[PDB]
């Protein structure tokens, strides 16, 4: 139950430095493990960035990045860090922290425990929080005894937006679509759920939208018009 | 660096069938080869290392084999939850590198979409744009044709589609199509319709509304 969690900005300007923190719980950074950074590009390719040993200054870096990357640790906070300088749009990616695998007394540089991934976009454009609009249930969205409803999350930058329903109590039947990039350069997505039509008068449906890059949180109750 | 290449890029197989995924190294990595599974929205999960040793608790249907430059991951009998991208990674020397992934899709029987349409909200219309949304829910296979019509005029170039990843339990997809018009254009037409063609529909299904009608 070692757990890792990345944090840091989601938008970095070209030529500036991307900084991320990994906070570890359930285990100490000052342990006999190497702590790693990996990134995943929009096209889904994976690239290992580098590592740092928990018990010494030992580090290994991908030579394709060695001139502009630094990994460090703060064992008083149980954190380790990534700094990537002189960034460009090619550095847009999901950045993961991870702990390497050990079994018994043997370790290998493969990744056992991973964080959740920090989405980072390198762009000159400014952050923009979304507008949230209801996809209200109506006879136009009722088929047999089932109704569809949702929320349209429009015009935000950069990724990501997360959506839950009823504070996480409603998960069955939910579909949160991948975002699309609009002609305006802003993203949009929708999240929908199907429910019994008979529940529309007897249950409340609220979509909970979070866009961390703009510090935007919205709860929208979606009801028939 | 050593370069890892995976094939095929995508695999689509029915439950119960054997999936065979290949990984090639540009120079020998001996046995220093691991496999990961990545499901949507999650980090990769380590499955196999040392070419053939399973991580603790791994289902037996996953097996690794090979040596040198040629490796295989087998899934002996696919299950719906096995939808994922599978990656290999060597650890023979530095830097560590990964293959480009093989996406494994699950076949299932044809399932027709349920179709739903949503007019623009009054709140959005207050701001000069109208988004009209057509939802196709829980269908298989992924291919579908969605045609928008506005007062019987076929629209082209003013919609964008998004599709979910395959569902881990029922192996279906859902799809949204969003038609974007200016508010001024939206208010000049009456009938908004989305017409859906799909393998599971004997003939196309149209859902429509008249602007204004509640």
């Amino acid at each position: 139950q070692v757990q890792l969690q990345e944090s840091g900005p989601g938008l970095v300007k070209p030529s500036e430095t991307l900084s991320l923190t990994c906070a570890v719980s359930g285990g100490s950074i000052s342990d006999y493990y190497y702590w790693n950074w990996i990134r995943q590009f929009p096209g889904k390719g994976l690239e290992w960035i580098g590592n740092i040993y928990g018990k010494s200054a030992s580090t290994y870096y991908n030579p394709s990045l060695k001139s502009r990357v630094s990994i460090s640790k703060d064992t008083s906070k149980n954190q380790f860090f990534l700094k990537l300088s002189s960034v460009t749009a090619a550095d847009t990616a999901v950045y993961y922290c991870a702990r390497e695998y050990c079994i018994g007394s043997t370790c290998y540089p493969i990744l056992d425990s991973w964080g959740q991934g920090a989405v980072v976009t390198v762009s000159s454009a400014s952050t923009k929080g979304p507008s949230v609009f209801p996809l209200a249930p109506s006879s136009k969205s009722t088929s047999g005894g089932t109704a569809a409803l949702g929320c349209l999350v429009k015009d935000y930058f950069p990724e990501p937006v997360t959506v839950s329903w009823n504070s996480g109590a409603l998960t069955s039947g939910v579909h949160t679509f991948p975002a699309v990039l609009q002609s305006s350069g802003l993203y949009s997505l929708s999240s929908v759920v199907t429910v019994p039509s008979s529940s529309l008068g007897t249950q409340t449906y609220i979509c909970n939208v979070n866009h961390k890059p703009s510090n935007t949180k919205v709860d929208k109750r979606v009801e028939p018009k | 660096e050593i370069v890892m290449t995976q094939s095929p890029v995508t695999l689509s197989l029915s439950p119960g069938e054997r999936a065979t995924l290949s990984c090639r190294a540009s120079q020998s990595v001996n046995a220093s080869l691991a496999w990961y599974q990545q499901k949507p929205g999650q980090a990769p999960r380590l499955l196999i290392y040392d070419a053939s040793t399973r991580a603790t608790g791994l289902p037996d249907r996953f097996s690794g084999s090979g040596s040198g430059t040629e490796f295989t991951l087998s899934i002996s009998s696919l299950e719906p939850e096995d939808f994922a991208v599978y990656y290999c990674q060597h650890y023979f020397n530095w830097p560590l590198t990964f293959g480009g992934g093989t996406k494994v899709e699950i076949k299932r029987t044809v399932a027709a979409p349920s179709v739903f349409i949503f007019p623009p909200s009054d709140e959005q219309l207050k701001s000069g744009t109208a988004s009209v949304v057509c939802l196709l829910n829980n269908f298989y296979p992924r291919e579908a044709k969605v045609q928008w019509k506005v007062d019987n005029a076929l629209q082209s170039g003013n919609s964008q589609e998004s599709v979910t990843e395959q569902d881990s339990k029922d192996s279906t997809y859902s799809l949204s199509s969003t038609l974007t018009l200016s508010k001024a254009d939206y208010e000049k037409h009456k009938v908004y319709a989305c017409e859906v063609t799909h393998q599971g529909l004997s003939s196309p299904v149209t859902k429509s509304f008249n602007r204004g009608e509640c």
Partner: peptide
């Protein structure tokens, strides 16, 4: 290939 005893660094 790369491997280490748990109480040692890589080479």
């Amino acid at each position: 290939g790369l491997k280490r005893d748990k109480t040692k660094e890589y080479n």
